[PDB]
Amino acid sequence: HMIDVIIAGGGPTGLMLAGELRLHGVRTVVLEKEPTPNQHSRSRGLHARSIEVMDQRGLLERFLAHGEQFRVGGFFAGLAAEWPADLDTAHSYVLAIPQVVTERLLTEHATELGAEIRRGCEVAGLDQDADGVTAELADGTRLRARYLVGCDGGRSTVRRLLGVDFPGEPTRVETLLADVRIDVPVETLTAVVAEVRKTQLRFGAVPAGDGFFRLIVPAQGLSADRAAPTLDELKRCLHATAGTDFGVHSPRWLSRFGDATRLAERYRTGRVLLAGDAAHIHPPTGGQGLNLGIQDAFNLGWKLAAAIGGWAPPDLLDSYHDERHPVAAEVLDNTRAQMTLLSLDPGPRAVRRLMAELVEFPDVNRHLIEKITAIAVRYDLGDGHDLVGRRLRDIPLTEGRLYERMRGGRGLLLDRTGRLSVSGWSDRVDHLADPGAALDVPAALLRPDGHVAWVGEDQDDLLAHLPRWFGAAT
Amino acid sequence: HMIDVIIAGGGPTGLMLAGELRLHGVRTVVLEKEPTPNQHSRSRGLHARSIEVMDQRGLLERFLAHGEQFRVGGFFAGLAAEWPADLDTAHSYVLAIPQVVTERLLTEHATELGAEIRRGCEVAGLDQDADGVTAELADGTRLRARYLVGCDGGRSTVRRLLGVDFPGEPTRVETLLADVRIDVPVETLTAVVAEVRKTQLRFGAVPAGDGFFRLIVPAQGLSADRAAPTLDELKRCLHATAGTDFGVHSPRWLSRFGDATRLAERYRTGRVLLAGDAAHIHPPTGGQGLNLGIQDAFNLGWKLAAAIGGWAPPDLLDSYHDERHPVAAEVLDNTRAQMTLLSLDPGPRAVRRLMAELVEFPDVNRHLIEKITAIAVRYDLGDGHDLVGRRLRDIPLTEGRLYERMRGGRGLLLDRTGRLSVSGWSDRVDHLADPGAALDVPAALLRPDGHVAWVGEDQDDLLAHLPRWFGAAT
Numbered sequence: 017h018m019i020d021v022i023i024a025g026g027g028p029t030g031l032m033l034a035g036e037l038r039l040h041g042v043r044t045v046v047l048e049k050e051p052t053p054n055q056h057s058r059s060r061g062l063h064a065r066s067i068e069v070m071d072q073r074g075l076l077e078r079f080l081a082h083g084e085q086f087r088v089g090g091f092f093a094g095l096a097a098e099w100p101a102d103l104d105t106a107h108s109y110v111l112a113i114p115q116v117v118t119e120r121l122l123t124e125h126a127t128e129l130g131a132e133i134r135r136g137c138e139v140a141g142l143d144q145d146a147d148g149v150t151a152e153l154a155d156g157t158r159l160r161a162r163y164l165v166g167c168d169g170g171r172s173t174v175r176r177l178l179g180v181d182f183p184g185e186p187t188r189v190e191t192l193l194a195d196v197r198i199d200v201p202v203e204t205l206t207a208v209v210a211e212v213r214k215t216q217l218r219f220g221a222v223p224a225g226d227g228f229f230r231l232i233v234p235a236q237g238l239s240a241d242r243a244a245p246t247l248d249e250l251k252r253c254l255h256a257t258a259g260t261d262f263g264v265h266s267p268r269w270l271s272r273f274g275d276a277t278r279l280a281e282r283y284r285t286g287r288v289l290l291a292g293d294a295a296h297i298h299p300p301t302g303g304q305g306l307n308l309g310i311q312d313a314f315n316l317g318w319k320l321a322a323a324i325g326g327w328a329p330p331d332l333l334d335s336y337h338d339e340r341h342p343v344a345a346e347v348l349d350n351t352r353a354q355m356t357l358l359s360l361d362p363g364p365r366a367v368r369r370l371m372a373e374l375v376e377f378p379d380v381n382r383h384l385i386e387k388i389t390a391i392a393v394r395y396d397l398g399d400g401h402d403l404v405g406r407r408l409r410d411i412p413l414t415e416g417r418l419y420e421r422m423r424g425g426r427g428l429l430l431d432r433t434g435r436l437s438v439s440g441w442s443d444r445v446d447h448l449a450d451p452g453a454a455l456d457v458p459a460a461l462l463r464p465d466g467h468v469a470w471v472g473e474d475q476d477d478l479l480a481h482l483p484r485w486f487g488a489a490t
Numbered sequence: 491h492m493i494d495v496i497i498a499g500g501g502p503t504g505l506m507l508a509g510e511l512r513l514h515g516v517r518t519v520v521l522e523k524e525p526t527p528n529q530h531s532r533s534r535g536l537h538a539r540s541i542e543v544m545d546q547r548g549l550l551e552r553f554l555a556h557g558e559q560f561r562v563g564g565f566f567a568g569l570a571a572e573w574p575a576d577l578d579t580a581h582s583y584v585l586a587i588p589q590v591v592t593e594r595l596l597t598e599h600a601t602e603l604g605a606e607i608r609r610g611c612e613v614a615g616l617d618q619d620a621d622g623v624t625a626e627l628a629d630g631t632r633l634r635a636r637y638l639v640g641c642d643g644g645r646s647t648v649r650r651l652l653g654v655d656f657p658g659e660p661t662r663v664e665t666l667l668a669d670v671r672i673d674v675p676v677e678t679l680t681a682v683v684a685e686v687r688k689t690q691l692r693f694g695a696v697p698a699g700d701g702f703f704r705l706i707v708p709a710q711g712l713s714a715d716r717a718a719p720t721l722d723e724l725k726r727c728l729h730a731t732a733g734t735d736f737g738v739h740s741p742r743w744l745s746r747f748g749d750a751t752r753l754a755e756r757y758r759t760g761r762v763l764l765a766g767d768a769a770h771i772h773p774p775t776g777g778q779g780l781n782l783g784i785q786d787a788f789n790l791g792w793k794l795a796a797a798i799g800g801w802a803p804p805d806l807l808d809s810y811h812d813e814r815h816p817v818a819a820e821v822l823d824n825t826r827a828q829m830t831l832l833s834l835d836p837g838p839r840a841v842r843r844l845m846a847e848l849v850e851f852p853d854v855n856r857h858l859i860e861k862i863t864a865i866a867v868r869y870d871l872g873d874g875h876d877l878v879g880r881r882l883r884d885i886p887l888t889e890g891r892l893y894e895r896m897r898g899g900r901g902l903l904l905d906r907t908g909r910l911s912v913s914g915w916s917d918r919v920d921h922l923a924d925p926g927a928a929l930d931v932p933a934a935l936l937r938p939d940g941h942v943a944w945v946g947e948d949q950d951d952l953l954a955h956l957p958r959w960f961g962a963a964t
């Protein structure tokens with residue numbers, strides 16, 4: 017019938033959201049401005065919680081088929097350190113996979129599930145009322161739906177049109193990124209990079225396989241125009257930072273970015289929501305935007321589908337803002353911390369030497385990696401038990417593993433007591449009755465995003481907790 | 491006969507040095523510029539390694555009689571945190587004692603041991619040759635000795651006259667200190683301080699008992715003259731930082747200081763040495779200068795006495811620079827780290843929030859406190875064994891404790907094997923033959939400063955190690 021949800025923007029956030037909505041029959045149209053997929057790959061991989069999320073939906077096998085697992089140092093502000101031996105996840109690794117391939121994989125999955133991706137379609141305006149949202153496209157055509165989600169990136173058109181304030185710290189430091197060929201061998205390049213880095217940690221060089229290299233080099237001041245830089249400006253900035261320009265020539269990508277950290281004041285404005293870079297910006301350098309955007313979509317999907325299905329309780333959609341807005345605030349702040357630790361100044365450099373001492377302690381190294389990989393996220397769901405609000409890691413069952421049972425994106429009561437029941441909610445919550453499950457609690461109610469809503473062994477207590485995330489008994 | 495050592499400056503460094511030299515019969519003259527002891531107290535106490543040092547020389551009882559032990563939070567960059575439960579010392583506390591009382595106690599001890607303190611005597615010039623040093627005093631009188639130690643503070647006359655370069659980071663931030671009366675009650679003062687501190691961590695207020703308060707408040711810019719500030723400038727800086735000047739009036743101390751960190755390039759220039767603030771400056775805010783200066787004197791004393799006694803091996807005096815110059819470098823750097831963690835800027839403030847998370851880990855809290863209390867100092871004495879180069883904490887003996895045997899300031903072989911011997915060195919090294927001593931090594935050779943020179947059980951190995959710190963067998 018009518019479109020249920022329109023998603024502005026077909027990046028990883030919107031695509032992951034499209035997939036989550038299609039698990040529940042939601043008619044979903046992604047409006048993506050560009051007529052062909054973008055080929056400039058941003059992130060080089062995925063962290064554990066994103067890896068876990070893919071596995072909960074059955075996508076990890078294809079992700080591992082298109083990537084390489086590794087466990088090396090340096091993921092927090094570039095501080096080299098052994099991989100934490102006791103990270104609290106069954107997916108304790110980093111998945112090296114270009115974001116272009118991540119976007120392809122999410123596009124194929126969204127399409128195979130029946131999301132309608134429309135390329136060449138730019139949202140230019142919106143008009144919402146009590147029953148839905150009309151998106152106005154740049155060619156004058158109009159689309160109606162029940163909800164509209166702005167997943168349209170850091171310069172979100174939806175955010176601007178809503179007037180949602182974007183407070184934070186403005187850009188004070190700019191950085192250039194170029195994918196260019198060089199007139200010197202690779203060995204010369206990497207030797208100079210290793211040397212410059214001892215002074216200037218913001219400089220970096222990563223080969224792509226085809227003789228192109230990705231160069232990251234500080235800009236000279238801020239720019240008046242905030243536009244893309246020219247090859248000559250790249251040479252100016254390379255000369256100042258490294259002494260040589262390595263004969264950079266024939267760019268295939270020239271870009272600029274700032275260290276601004278901004279956070280949308282409201283993730284929800286009536287029937288219109290924001291997710292991903294549309295809801296928060298922060299530097300690509302030490303940022304986590306790809307993971308953060310995917311996990312915004314993972315938080316919002318089942319809740320918005322519940323709204324469409326008619327069973328969402330009255331505060332459910334608002335729990336999206338209430339849970340994900342604090343998470344982004346902490347990512348933004350921790351990324352500011354990391355940028356400082358990369359600074360040239362003698363003060364920050366002294367702090368960096370201290371941090372290097374501290375990361376030799378396993379519980380520091382574990383603390384920093386669990387933070388940035390997002391496995392440590394805890395929503396405040398108002399209970400004392402430590403598990404409540406955290407995502408439950410994958411655990412062995414009698415046969416199989418917990419994440420194998422989550423592919424429908426529904427709720428899950430993991431019950432070892434042999435006694436509890438979610439009858440009245442079975443259409444929304446499965447009953448995983450397995451006393452051999454390797455979890456040292458009597459039972460735990462898991463929301464569709466894997467976050468623990470409740471731990472206990474009393475049926476009446478279980479019943480009192482169900483309506484909050486799963487609505488009324490039917 | 492002739493003066494053996496002249497000490498320029500009668501601060502805690504020079505006084506502690508005077509005491510260490512008098513343990514060995516060294517004729518010692520302290521030339522102190524001021525005619526009467528200074529009554530402005532700087533440090534408010536002593537940290538564990540300084541406490542340990544006093545106990546090794548039998549002074550702890552009088553220090554504890556004039557001070558209060560406490561174990562609270564906040565000693566590293568003001569980060570509140572429980573006292574580390576497993577600090578690796580028998581003296582695991584902080585000793586609150588005004589530095590004026592510390593200076594009195596060290597003066598009485600130096601005098602009771604026969605050091606000659608001469609007040610009103612300002613070193614103005616020096617002339618050294620192959621056999622000694624002549625100090626020229628500001629009134630034209632001249633004094634000859636074998637060695638001269640500049641313990642004359644951060645603007646050392648001896649350092650300047652030697653031409654020893656003082657490299658480091660210059661002052662970029664100034665701070666005011668005032669001991670003043672206020673026109674508001676104490677409760678009003680502390681409430682405003684608690685509030686301002688949430689923004690500006692460099693602000694502080696500490697009562698003295700007599701209705702005077704010590705105020706620490708950022709200066710406005712740098713000063714052209716670098717002189718003492720006026721009451722009006724204090725009001726200007728208080729108004730800018732806290733909104734009110736609390737009716738400050740009738741100062742009894744007005745002062746300014748900068749955050750410069752400088753380190754003398756050579757602790758020794760022929761027969762002239764530097765110790766304490768004469769060899770290194772760094773901010774009083776997060777600094778450790780009182781402890782650091784006392785422990786410089788503790789390193790130099792027995793070595794300089796060995797030179798006077800005629801048995802010092804050829805490199806012994808140079809080991810003073812080689813051991814204490816790296817220690818000061820790390821104190822200076824760690825103090826820069828702490829100053830950054832107190833900064834107003836959003837970057838440093840983000841790093842501070844991270845550090846607050848990390849200090850909740852016991853091994854972080856222990857690491858930071860053991861660093862600043864100096865118990866973690868390890869000289870590179872070229873051995874693999876972890877104890878070698880570290881000071882040995884106080885340990886129970888069969889009866890009594892190790893530090894009770896160190897009051898002569900001589901070497902000590904702690905021997906549990908029942909077999910070793912320092913015969914040939916007995917005048918310089920005592921033999922503590924106690925198999926019940928609570929140390930899980932066969933034996934350890936301790937230098938007169940308590941630092942472990944050697945761990946083993948083989949007599950021939952013990953013999954090969956003695957000459958390095960104790961000279962030739964007699």
Ligand SMILES: Cc1cc2nc3c(=O)[nH]c(=O)nc-3n(C[C@H](O)[C@H](O)[C@H](O)COP(=O)(O)OP(=O)(O)OC[C@H]3O[C@@H](n4cnc5c(N)ncnc54)[C@H](O)[C@@H]3O)c2cc1C
Pocket residue numbers: 024025026027028029030047048049050058059060061115137138139140167168169170172173174193291292293294300301303304305306307308309
């Ligand atoms: C150089 C670089 C390196 C990075 N490295 C990492 C990393 O290592 N780890 C990490 O976690 N993150 C990293 N990131 C961040 C990550 O790339 C972004 O956070 C991620 O792309 C966010 O996805 P998104 O779907 O929210 O938004 P985007 O990918 O920006 O996509 C939004 C989509 O909206 C479309 N669009 C825009 N306006 C409209 C409109 N009006 N109508 C319709 N469609 C519209 C755009 O065409 C685009 O396809 C990096 C980013 C960069 C630039």
Ligand SMILES: Cc1cc2nc3c(=O)[nH]c(=O)nc-3n(C[C@H](O)[C@H](O)[C@H](O)COP(=O)(O)OP(=O)(O)OC[C@H]3O[C@@H](n4cnc5c(N)ncnc54)[C@H](O)[C@@H]3O)c2cc1C
Pocket residue numbers: 498499500501502503504521522523524532533534535589611612613614641642643644646647648667765766767768774775777778779780781782783
């Ligand atoms: C406000 C403040 C707070 C501090 N708080 C702490 C703290 O909490 N913890 C800590 O560890 N440290 C602290 N310190 C640092 C500590 O006070 C100094 O490091 C300590 O005084 C160093 O002692 P010193 O003997 O080397 O030098 P100084 O105490 O400076 O003494 C040198 C002496 O030389 C004399 N003199 C100078 N020139 C001559 C000359 N030409 N001839 C003869 N005599 C001369 C001076 O009169 C003086 O008595 C603080 C310092 C200040 C100012």
